[PDB]
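worker-03 picked up job from queue 'complexes'. Input manifest follows; two sequence lines, order preserved.
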Amino acid sequence: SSVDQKAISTIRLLAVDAVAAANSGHPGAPLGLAPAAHAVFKKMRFNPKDTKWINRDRFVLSNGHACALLYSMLVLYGYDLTVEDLKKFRQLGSKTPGHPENTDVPGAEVTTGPLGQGICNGVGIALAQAQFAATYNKPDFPISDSYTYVFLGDGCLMEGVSSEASSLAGHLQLGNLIAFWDDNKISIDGSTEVAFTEDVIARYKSYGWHIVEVSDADTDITAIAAAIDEAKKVTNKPTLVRLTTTIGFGSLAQGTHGVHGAPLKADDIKQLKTKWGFNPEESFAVPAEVTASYNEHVAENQKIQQQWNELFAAYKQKYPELGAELQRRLDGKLPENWDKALPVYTPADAAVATRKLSEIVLSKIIPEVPEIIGGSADLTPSNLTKAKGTVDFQPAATGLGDYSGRYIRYGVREHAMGAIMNGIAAFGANYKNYGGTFLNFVSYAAGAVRLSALSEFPITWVATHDSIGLGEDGPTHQPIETLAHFRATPNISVWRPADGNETSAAYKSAIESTHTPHILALTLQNLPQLEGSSIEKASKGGYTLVQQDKADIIIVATGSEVSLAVDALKVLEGQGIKAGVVSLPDQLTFDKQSEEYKLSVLPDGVPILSVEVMSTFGWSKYSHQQFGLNRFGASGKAPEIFKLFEFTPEGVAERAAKTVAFYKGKDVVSPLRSAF
Amino acid sequence: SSVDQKAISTIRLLAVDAVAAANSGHPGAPLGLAPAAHAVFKKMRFNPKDTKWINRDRFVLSNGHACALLYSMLVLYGYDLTVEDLKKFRQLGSKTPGHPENTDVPGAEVTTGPLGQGICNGVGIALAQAQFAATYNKPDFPISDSYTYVFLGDGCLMEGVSSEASSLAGHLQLGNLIAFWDDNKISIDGSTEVAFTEDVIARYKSYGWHIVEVSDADTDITAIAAAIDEAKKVTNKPTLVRLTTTIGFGSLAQGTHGVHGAPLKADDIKQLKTKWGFNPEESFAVPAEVTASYNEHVAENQKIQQQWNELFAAYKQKYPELGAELQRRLDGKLPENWDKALPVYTPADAAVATRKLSEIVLSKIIPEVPEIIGGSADLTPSNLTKAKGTVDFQPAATGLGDYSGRYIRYGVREHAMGAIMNGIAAFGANYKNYGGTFLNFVSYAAGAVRLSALSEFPITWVATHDSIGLGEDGPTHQPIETLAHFRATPNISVWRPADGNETSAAYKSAIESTHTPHILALTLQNLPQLEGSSIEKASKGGYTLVQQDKADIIIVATGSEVSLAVDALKVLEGQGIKAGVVSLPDQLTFDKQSEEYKLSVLPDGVPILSVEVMSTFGWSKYSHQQFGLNRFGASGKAPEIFKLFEFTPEGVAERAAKTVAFYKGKDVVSPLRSAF
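worker-03 finished. Artifact:
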């Protein structure tokens, strides 16, 4: 009868019809959460005609399988998504994929579906919003005062990544974050009683969250709206709103785990429509009264943005410096000549570990580039990720930092750090944010890292202690598979810089990135500055370090093994073998160079040996023979481990000589060549 | 003055001296936890001369960086570890690596160090102990009544994997588990106040854990012992014992985060020794009164084991069937001819998805092999991991199952499922345990999976929905990098079976495994039974499916792409090209075959094309050219996705023809050949 009721029914039936058209997808949660979605979007400020408005409230569907729900909202509010797109739910080439993709779906802030991720992304959006507001807001100029709204399900609450992020969100007193738990007592295996009996509310209170409970979230949208208002009044705690719902509300199978992930039966859909006043013979129906009511909210929001645009214009006049910086960031541009701050080295400079070179880079570029923030997962004094003179990101009320701070104490929470980094990037305003841990424990965060790549987010991992080079901590800490794993993931730039100049190139890439996450693999041990390295050469991803016109062999290497390759070249000289050396600091950047550039670095007609003290996987793209480490490491002094595995000038030279012998009297084509 | 005091001091100074000798490692937690370690080991039943006694209490050092502490205990109790081994702490080739390794260190139940893992391993040990006791205990025959003791630090409590496992341990009412939190207010970054302010105790109560707090765990070993007794009285809740300690107790830097991970200064070590009555000029001192007191506890424990051995002997007489089964499992042997239960298929059988073939295998072998237990991370109706007629593992008090049950409801907790699986394997008694999820979300558990490999634990992942073949769920669910990641990890068998016979071979491998974790990559889509497949052929890891003496090309493939390769062979026939087909269901099993077997499958003198609908990484070990998918997937009907990416008989045949052309008039050697 009310237009709110009609809208809720419309949302539910659009979602059910999308799933029916695909004969695939999940109608249960969309049916149970449509009342909450309606209430939340009515409280949100957003512009369907400007999905990038920096002061929009953000919505994250963390239970992303429910995405027919998200798409229905975006269609009804006039985003660049139509009923015809809904009819193509889960079909190849459509803008309505089975789980929302921020690269494809207008109004999808992040890519969700893998459970636990969205809520952590929302923590990051709210973290960025707090940092952004603390940086730019002035008296009478609330440039940023937006909220982050997250829908999540029981599964999200079982995933450890969400515990990590919720502990940290409570610690950070993020009162700009409002999360909604779909408390429907059903997961995929059946009742939550079989595996999930914890006192969720008590746990969230233990993190410092504020709680509002809505006992009838099936129908009481007034209570949902009041819970939002109450959440906003509690400015020093993130709020969890418990929505007690009936999964699949209205279905003959409502409240049972059948409605979870299977299209409804035809007769079920027919009785749904009839009892709510819709035509059972019609699909994808949109009552004009619903879109009119929604259009009114859009019009109010567009007026709010217009007033915000005038506020921003007045801000730029009263604070021309801050206003120009803000305009620049909103345009997606770094400061002019920011890269003049990158340090440059020569072979007369001392040997330095690349974790220490990384600390130096950050010390130089953080003052120059305000949109850089980052932190470490409780390894700040080992990753060397904090630039002296910056303040930690903390609620001012704690005395430990300020929301304008730029260094984040993630604690021992690698996975959530990864997903929060995705949320900070997703906020926009050109944030270029980073997170430090040991390379071997980036793997803890694999779920989020692959979503960085799929989402095209320019986040950066500062991943130190990259190999057996770390020594005594031993094989539980020493990467073997790690670079192969992320190099095999599409759209990850995996930098393993060999020296000072290469480390500057890696940061030049990571900070200028707009669509590609970075992992910087950095050493504990000191490496010499190379003859022939430079920022601009290393910026090609792969380059000729030692050019040898009459090469018997080219040794291609990365990181700490480039200096090793050069030392092996000298041993080979003594044997009358002429070797060239290629440094390959990033395979992805190299791969995207022109074919003729790539073939000049790895030409035809010379055998190529790769040297890297980790897995040989991937290396046949660039080499004919691979010298690597395909077993776990060992606890001991690093030089002794290298000796044991013959990663020595003589050990490399021996294998280079055997590689030359292997191909003697056979002509060889570049490993870059492919039959198709 | 007391011998308890002298023992605590001995433990502390052995740990400090080990770190000093290495000039590497962490003295803080060993100093703070030595009183608790002393108290706990005095309450434990164990035999240093039989580390495999099945009714021993288990100890897990989850804060594994503290392992100088563990080694000191093992030395003082006369395990196969000596003071001379301690002097070689963190040295290459020693039995005292920087983090404990169950493969190397007598008395190390699991490999710890990566934070969060050990406590989850302890949940698994206790889960296995409950299941084992419920299976075999009889009236007057308490065959199994052992406890699991875990030490953990603040970092472990921040890692999401430990939240997952602690939620589940509370749900499972595991009163045989006692965990001790080193509440010392310090992590690597400094005070826990900067990132970890949650009410830990309230959170653990919310999971259903019992709490005992020891306010002075620096000195009150009577309170620690009473907390253990109180924990044992609470049989229906796991217990968390809060140990409030001074990190680095006794050091000049005690209670500061300097003592965390750096060797103490020489003068600090000297004042430590003097004030506790030791010689500052002596290192690795062991007062005879301490080892005498410890020897007395060993003697009592050996008497307990001797009585247990007599109890077992009487058990075998009264229950010859159960007793023979138990003896068999303790001997590490599967039932005779267990593999007669594996199903065998022919090409006259219908096409079946390998997730469904997997369900059939489990239905046949679970009744035959009692040491198989497993579960799913809330994907039981999609993984098809439960054999009908089994009961869930649950406390009888819940009405949802029994501790004798064999199917585990892990909930949406992939990472903890992985580490709990490691603990179940670590318990011993020949447990062969498994866990199901989508292949793409095995990656959530990467931290634990790599420890499965490093620990040599025969755990099994039942990893369904292995590729774009799953269709509509789209690229957030579709593996690309996943197999490359785990194939690049040493010691993981990664099975991707093509049909019914191959799926039986994969389980034959996974269940007979004693030292190698398995991942079974299984399809949602139906695949035909192959002409030429068999269990015994597929058990070679790689084999010739279609032998072609005059091959122009060999197509090597896995899983769903083997049938594709055969269809492409038929297209190629029409073009006058003769192709052979190799099926490579497990690369690791294949790699370990003899050189001459491997060369008969992938011989010299014929170009080899690989076909697999995921990353091409690793494939150059077996092929000259690789047809794979090195971009993310798409949401749509699977056949349309395959068509789009040209994974069709014609698309493969085209690339096979171009591969033949590429090598025309050049003789080719097997990709297996290497120069060194």
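worker-03 released lock.
Chain B touches chain A through 121 residues (CB under 8 Å).
Residues 288-318 of chain B form the longest helix (31 residues).
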